[PDB]
């Protein structure tokens, strides 16, 4: 959108929430006071509709964020969660019952898989898997009991991009009433407009790019009108909420999301292009890089890139080589999470990736390195990476 | 304990968390940085044991609170949640599988009931009910599939106190492996030492007295050694956590919990004694008041009282009488939640209470008024209540 | 007042600030938005009168605290500062110019003295000193150019209590238009109602008991109608303000100030009475203890005590004894500040105190110990002190 | 510098402050605990050198920000203040005494001027004024008692850029030991490396671009080695500090300062170039625009631009036209401050500016419009300005 940046600056900022400041007020509250019985009745009737009722439903600060998220992702409502993993687990749980079946991409975030295999399984809900590029063939995996189809594009760690139009079309042909979900964290909800593709719910670890500074955790799930009420009421029955201050900080992160993502795109594509020419690199998994799995879909369906990608080295590094490589970076830091201002580096052994690719086998044998490209000078990052290569040459 | 106040002041405050200040540092984080591969391996091995690993597991701020809660309630570990309702729902969920049965007091908090009837039911887990005074007779309700027995003493709104020794003994005679849980919010975890009575897990809406100021929401669940790992790992698979700042504010609330509770006890018992003599009052439900349901158990099993209690008026007030009464209080405010510094008032119609007392019928027909007695001058509160009575005489 | 606890719970909490919650909202702002030119003009006219104008003047959060402090201390306005030392320095500075003279108690807080001797002096403002028990004889020290009379009752460290009625009556006889100020931190502004005694400005380190938890730092100055505009505008010209969050935490602290102070009073008076009987104690300096300097004025003029006081040992400790004593306490900690939930201990040799008693000597030769008595169980604190005495006997 | 973005991401982030997280911990404290007498002595000796001593000196959070600011601005120390106006007032005050003279640019921020004329003057410190383009001719205004030369480049509102090399060389010829200060807020301390030009102290309203989101208020002053101790100790005697949380939020703001400033530069230069072509615009005052006063010094001496500038309309608006223009913008808002993510607009008549140009007249007669260009899509901002022009044509 030629207006995305204006939208990011303004989303959620209504006078009833800001009360004269630029940002929403921070309203910290469990108790919300009813001046009269009539006010209490009105609040009770509208307790899920943005009238102050009880802190577990939200205060003005949450309502402001919810409105911002619905504007930006084009949904009827936005559920809030203590983190991304809580958003995934509780959004799925909100729509499954015993005897149901979940069809999930085998490139899904590992905690999302483990929720399915270790929590859903014991509650009489089964989970099947599909390859991220299955396209229309996903119709062959839809079972009569399949209630949820769970997408994640690009995939975790390995970055494969779905053909969402093909998947959604097939799904709607066989099971039109299915709930289609996507973990849209990589796109920060704004580089891939999931609800415009017929997906029902767009889930985010707002922890990542929305917070944008590695110092807050929160999950969001923006649902279309069809699914909102079931998502909202079942998530609430599980007590799912976020504190008002983190909600404020997520709204605040939105304001710089455009300038941040443009830099992450520029810098990470430059690094990926360099890696793709490098003699010590076997493969580069960057959706914006020509040749990456699902790249043509990224070009067609996304409006940009973020800064997280991965590449495969020429060999499965030993523990000793991993230390010489990873321990001595000057700018990249080893840590989980991503989407912040700093660059991060992590290693995944191929066998370990195989272990979180259910009913599939990986097609590489070198150590996989996942990079988050932050806001540092890109030439300094390249020098850091080159020093890393020299330590394992 | 003659040392409870010293314990409250000091619990959780170790140098590794406070780093020279009186209170723990606030460490806001998703990304936790591993300086070396060996540090990452050590953190991974100990990722549930208080080594910094990932923000979803906690930072130093969470670890400090967890240690404080385990010291005060005598547990092996403490799981953290976005609110009390999340603690209840996810602690139960952590121990049930399809085909299991939950036995819950029919005086349980309404959201706890609704979690059971609207979430568990659809996942192949059934829920039966028991009267809060069932004592040893609870053995007759234990089914072969009963995995969880859920206590709440005193009960929500109506304040009936369990005979926990009798309940636990019966349960251990019939189903020793059962998971016995209690919602110990009213006692703030410290006026009733649940794990000392053979209960497995003590759950709190820390939102209430631990936060103590009506401006933060958080749930806790402190488990014995038998149950800790299952609670911890399954809650984590559901993404359950609290933000670091609210964890800091819960630790901070602990420091004044003793002085606060002593005032709430004194003031509320005085109000209850006055109400018990009042011609417009049919019943007073205060566990510390002679004559209240389960009072003798409160005297035997609790080390004090908090400030929440209820009473029954002589009549079922109409909507109009409810407004004349509730709208014109000067000091009491109408709001949900409790456990703060201010006094609160809410009305519950008898028919409404009947509706949240499954497989039971209430034994009163007047409107029930629930009072939270805060830190105001008690004589001013009495004058406010007297003015209320005059408006409906 | 028989309503002070009700006032503490309710002060500053108007709907325009709370907007539905129990506590005021936290409005973080520099920019405050004017919808129209007319709105901008109105805000400009009322920029010192609680209309949103610019964050340096305050937001809703500051206005709420300002109203609370004016209600509790009975003033026309309350200026806010980054800490207590800033409140003292800038409140004095607001009322002086080259050629003026300040008359200050020689028991004033050491940073207050240093502000006078190291900042004011080179700006052409002289400072004279008086003994805290001077009473009516202060009239003899008033010079033609005396502009400010600065009180601190009880005094720092040595705890001498002024005869404020005698001092004020004498000042008003000679210099009726003098600006009489007090550092009222020990009373937390509520145990001694300074403005009711004819003092013009009551200054506090809200850092201490108002915050109550040893984390936030903030200064306040509550002025009568005669002095408010000059205080407000001149402090504003020095850019003095506090952040919105600390202002929120100060308002929040007020709510438990009554229950906290009653415990600090009860426990510190007990400790003082015990020390007074102890053979290793030469003197106890506690305003509430009979025999302490100015005790009779404390009993007449205050409505209670806080928890800070000092005592003099029966000997001068050697450096080895100071370490053996101080290094090995179990519950008392060595730190500056006070007014929190935990107990603190510091030591000073007589000549250290003499060096901060301008134009005076000290009347003791033993080591002085300053104690802050927190919220721990008092018998535990007594055992800690007894163990310390045994280490130096 | 080709490393400025890497420096912004990493400045101040040492392990002793971050303790495992990406950002520094937030250590809220007044009291800082000494485990032993020897530890207390060590902290005392190093109380201005980054050892924990007392919260008025700072905690780990402040130390981290101080180190970041010294690295980025190339100074020996950084003093912290509650807002920019406090930093200006207290940094000047730290270096003057009765009989001294201050020489200030007549384009200085109005509160800075008012501090000089309304506070300093009655303390025996005189202030003289100079035109911002005076250059080497400032030598003729240096008096025997001139102690401080105060620069502000670009100037407030009218944006004139000094020739700092010429000014500094002239001052050093006549008064080599003068204290040369600059309010470097517009450059955010990084677009103009003041200390590299021989300026002694670089002051900022960190409120503006460092915070970057219009919420926090904070002042900073970075001094060279010659001036640091006097600045530090005299600001400390006035109690000047910032709260730990705002210090954290300032460090956090640094991380996105590069990506934000590049957008503000690009967008504001585009708007300025467009306004310069517009028939309703008489003049554009933007340091980066050719023809603007001192533009050539901006191009030589700065490494970029921020987003604040002004322009002069082709006529003097009537009051009716001012309302029609200002009241009806869709994206630009009327508010004070700047440096955030959103665009702002204010107006001043020529005589308003003349009244804050001491000893000078203004050289324009049209209404002056000050714009802050935020992060919105620039074509949307242009359309908003075009619609405004149509309302007054
Ligand atoms: C990081 C991650 C999550 C987890 O969110 P948390 O806030 O860390 O619980 C979920 N989905 C994806 C794609 C992620 O990368
Ligand atoms: C208030 C309440 C809860 C709910 O906790 P929230 O933090 O409000 O979700 C749970 N149990 C009891 C007994 C309660 O009163
Ligand atoms: C604490 C103290 C101060 C200074 O307050 P800070 O907030 O630490 O700057 C002022 N007066 C008294 C009496 C104090 O004890
Ligand atoms: C904003 C402003 C200041 C004052 O800063 P505050 O934080 O608002 O007190 C100082 N100098 C300049 C140039 C300013 O624009």
Residue B92 in tokens: 């139960």
Residue D320 CA to residue D315 CA, distance in Å, equals 14
Residues with CB under 6 A from ligand 2: A 30, 56, 239; B 83-85, 88, 109, 156, 183, 185, 205, 207-208, 217, 219, 337
Residues with Cβ within 8 Å of C67's Cβ and at least 6 positions away in sequence, in order, are: C11, C12, C14, C17, C50
Q: Which whole-number Å values give the CA distances from B171 to B146, B181, C11, in the listed order?
A: 10, 12, 50
Q: Between B and C, how many CB-CB pairs are < 8 A?
A: 100
Residue B123 in tokens: 């996942």
Out of D57, D208, D260, D370, the active site residue is D208
Distance, CA of D123 to chain centre:
25
Answer yes or no: do A238 and B86 touch at CB < 8 A.
yes
Contact residues, chain B, for A88 at CB < 8 Å: 239
* Closest residue by Cα to residue C205 from C223, C227, C189: C189
Residues with Cβ within 8 Å of A99's Cβ and at least 6 positions away in sequence, in order, are: A124, A125, A145
**D78 has which bridge partners?**
D222
* CB D317 near ligand 4, within 6 Å: no
Answer yes or no: do D32 and B20 touch at CB < 8 A.
yes
Answer yes or no: do A35 and B240 touch at CB < 8 A.
no
Beta strand ranges found along chain C (DSSP E): 77-81, 101-105, 126-130, 146-152, 179-183, 201-205, 219-223, 281-285, 308-313, 344-348, 368-372
Give the catalytic positions of A in this structure: 56, 109, 183, 208
State residue A55 phi and psi, 5-degree precision. Answer: -55, -30
Shortest CA distance from C251: residue in chain B: B213
**What is the per-residue burial (b if ≥16 Cβ within 10 Å, else e) of C155-189?**
bbbbbbbbbbebbbbbbeeebeebbbbbbbbbbbb
Residue C56 CA to residue C52 CA, distance in Å, equals 10
Whether the CB-CB separation of A143 and A97 falls below 8 Å is answered with no
3-state secondary structure at position D113: helix
Residue D81 CA to residue D220 CA, distance in Å, equals 6
Phi and psi based region of residue C282 (left: phi greater than 0; alpha: psi -120 to 50; beta: remaining): alpha
Judging by DSSP bridges, how do beta strands D281-285 and D308-313 pair with one another?
A: antiparallel
Residue C168 CA to residue C150 CA, distance in Å, equals 11
**What is the per-residue burial (b if ≥16 Cβ within 10 Å, else e) of D297-315?**
bbeebbebbbbbbbbbbbe
Distance, CA of C177 to chain centre:
24
Answer yes or no: do B26 and D28 touch at CB < 8 A.
yes
Answer yes or no: do B30 and A97 touch at CB < 8 A.
no
Residue B70 CA to residue B82 CA, distance in Å, equals 18
A21, A28, A29 member nearest C27 (Cβ): A21
Residues with CB under 6 A from ligand 1: A 83-85, 88, 109, 156, 183, 185, 205, 207-208, 217, 219, 337; B 30, 56, 239
CB of B32 less than 8 A from some CB of D: yes
Binding-site residues of A for Mg(2+), in ranges, read 10, 342, 354, 357, 360
Contact residues, chain D, for C82 at CB < 8 Å: 81-82, 86, 239-243
Mutate to test the pocket of ligand 1, among A207, A240, A370 (most ligand atoms within 8 A of CB): A207
D124, D207, D243 member nearest C217 (Cβ): D243
Residue A103 CA to residue B276 CA, distance in Å, equals 60
C209 is catalytic: no
D208 is catalytic: yes
The data reach a resolution, in angstroms, of: 1.5
Residue C20 CA to residue C51 CA, distance in Å, equals 20
**Among the atoms of ligand 4, which is closest to the Cα of residue C30?**
8
- Count of beta carbons in the 10 Å neighbourhood of residue C144: 7
Quick one: DSSP state of residue A138? Answer: G
Residue B86 CA to residue C124 CA, distance in Å, equals 64
**What is the per-residue burial (b if ≥16 Cβ within 10 Å, else e) of B310-333?**
bbbbeebbeeebbbebbbebebbb
Handedness of CA A344, A345, A350, A352 (dihedral sign): negative
DSSP secondary structure of A254-301:
HTTHHHHHHHHHHHHHHHHHHHHT-TTEEEEE-TTSTTSTTHHHHHHH
Out of C57, C208, C252, C255, the active site residue is C208
Out of D183, D200, D243, D301, the active site residue is D183
Whether the CB-CB separation of A239 and A81 falls below 8 Å is answered with no
Q: Name the experimental technique.
A: X-ray
Answer yes or no: do D85 and C30 touch at CB < 8 A.
no
A20, A27, A60 member nearest C33 (Cβ): A20
Whether the CB-CB separation of B188 and B209 falls below 8 Å is answered with yes
D379 is catalytic: no
Residue D271 in tokens: 């708007």
Shortest CA distance from B110: residue in chain A: A237
Residue B251 CA to residue B255 CA, distance in Å, equals 7
**D223 has which bridge partners?**
D77, D201
For chain A, give the number of residues: 393
- Count of beta carbons in the 10 Å neighbourhood of residue A184: 27
* Closest residue by Cα to residue D308 from D288, D294, D281: D288
Residues with Cβ within 8 Å of A305's Cβ and at least 6 positions away in sequence, in order, are: A191, A261, A264, A265, A268, A269, A286, A287, A288, A298
DSSP secondary structure of A70-135:
HHHHT-SEEEEESSHHHHHHHHHHTT--TT-EEEEETTS-HHHHHIIIIIIGGGT-EEEEE-TT-G
**Among the atoms of ligand 1, which is closest to the Cα of residue A83?**
7
B19, B23, B33 member nearest D22 (Cβ): B33
* Closest residue by Cα to residue D24 from D217, D221, D252, D246: D252
* Closest residue by Cα to residue D294 from D151, D84, D104, D142: D151
Residue B392 CA to residue D168 CA, distance in Å, equals 81
* Closest residue by Cα to residue D100 from C122, C89, C118: C122
CB of C341 less than 8 A from some CB of D: no
Distance in Å, CA D56 to ligand 3 centroid: 10
Write the secondary structure of chain B as one string of H (helix), E (strand) and C (coil): CCCHHHHHHHCCCCHHHHCCECCCCECCCCCEEECCHHHHHHHHHCCCCCCCCCCCCCCHHHHHHHHHHHHHHCCCEEEEECCHHHHHHHHHHCCCCCCCEEEEECCCCHHHHHHHHHHHHHHCCEEEEECCCCHHHHHHHCCCCEEEEEEECCCCCCCCCCCHHHHHHHHHHHCCCCEEEEECCCCCCCCCCHHHHCCCEEEEECCCCCCCCCCCCCEEEEECCCCHHHHHHHHHHCCCCCCHHHHHHHHHHHCCHHHHHHHHHHHHHHHHHHHHCCCCEEEEECCCCCCCCCHHHHHHHCCCCCCEEEEEECCCCCHHHHHHHHCCCCCCEEECCCCCCCCEEEEECHHHHHHCCCCCCCCCCCCEEEEECCCCCHHHHHHHHHHHHHCCC
Residue C308 in tokens: 């800070």
State residue C29 phi and psi, 5-degree precision. Answer: -165, 140
CA distance A295 to chain D (A): 27
* CB D207 near ligand 4, within 6 Å: yes
Answer yes or no: do D2 and A213 touch at CB < 8 A.
no
Structural domains of chain D ordered from first start: 3-253 (3.40.640.10), 254-392 (3.90.1150.10)
User: At which residue do the structure tokens 């989407």 appear?
Assistant: A339
Shortest CA distance from C344: residue in chain B: B22
Give the catalytic positions of B in this structure: 56, 109, 183, 208
CB of C33 less than 8 A from some CB of A: yes
Q: Which whole-number Å values give the CA distances from D220 to C182, D82, D201, in the listed order?
A: 31, 9, 10
* Closest residue by Cα to residue B116 from B36, B183, B169: B183
Residue B268 CA to residue B209 CA, distance in Å, equals 15
**Among the atoms of ligand 1, which is closest to the Cα of residue B54?**
8
């Amino acid at each position: 959108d030629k207006h995305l940046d204006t939208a990011l600056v303004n989303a959620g900022r209504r006078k009833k929430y800001t009360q004269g400041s630029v940002n929403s007020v921070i309203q910290r509250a469990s108790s919300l006071v009813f001046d009269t019985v009539e006010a209490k009745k009105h609040a009770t009737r509208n307790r899920a509709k943005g009238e102050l009722f009880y802190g577990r439903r939200g205060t003005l600060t949450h309502f402001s964020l919810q409105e911002a998220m619905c504007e930006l992702e084009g949904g009827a409502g936005c559920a809030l969660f203590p983190c991304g993993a809580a958003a995934v687990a509780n959004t799925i749980l909100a729509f499954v019952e015993q005897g149901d079946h979940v069809l999930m991409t085998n490139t899904a975030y590992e905690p999302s898989q483990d929720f399915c295999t270790k929590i859903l399984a014991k509650l009489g809900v089964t989970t099947g898997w599909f390859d991220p590029l299955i396209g229309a063939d996903i119709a062959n995996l839809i079972q009569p009991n399949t209630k949820v189809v769970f997408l994640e594009s690009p995939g975790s760690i390995t970055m494969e991009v779905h053909d969402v139009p093909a998947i959604v079309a097939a799904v709607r042909r066989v099971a039109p009433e299915a709930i289609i979900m996507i973990d849209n964290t990589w796109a920060a909800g704004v580089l891939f407009k999931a609800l415009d593709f017929g997906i029902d719910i767009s889930i985010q670890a707002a922890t990542k790019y929305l917070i944008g500074h590695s110092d807050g955790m929160i999950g969001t799930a923006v649902a279309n009108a069809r699914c909102w009420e079931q998502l909202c009421e079942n998530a609430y029955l599980m007590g799912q909420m976020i504190d008002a201050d983190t909600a404020y900080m997520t709204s605040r992160g939105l304001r710089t999301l455009g300038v941040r993502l443009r830099q992450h795109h520029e810098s990470s594509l430059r690094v990926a292009e360099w890696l793709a020419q490098h003699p010590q690199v076997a493969r580069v998994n960057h959706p914006a890089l020509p040749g990456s799995k699902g790249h043509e879909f990224w070009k067609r369906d996304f409006s940009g890139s973020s800064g997280l990608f991965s590449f495969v080295l020429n060999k499965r590094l030993t523990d000793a080589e991993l230390a010489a490589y990873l321990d001595n970076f000057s700018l990249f830091s080893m840590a989980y999470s991503w989407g912040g201002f700093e660059s991060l580096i992590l290693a995944n052994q191929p066998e370990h990736i195989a272990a979180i690719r259910p009913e599939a086998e990986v097609d590489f044998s070198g150590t996989l390195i996942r990079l988050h490209i932050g806001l540092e000078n890109v030439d300094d990052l390249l020098a850091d990476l080159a020093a890393g290569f020299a330590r394992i040459v």
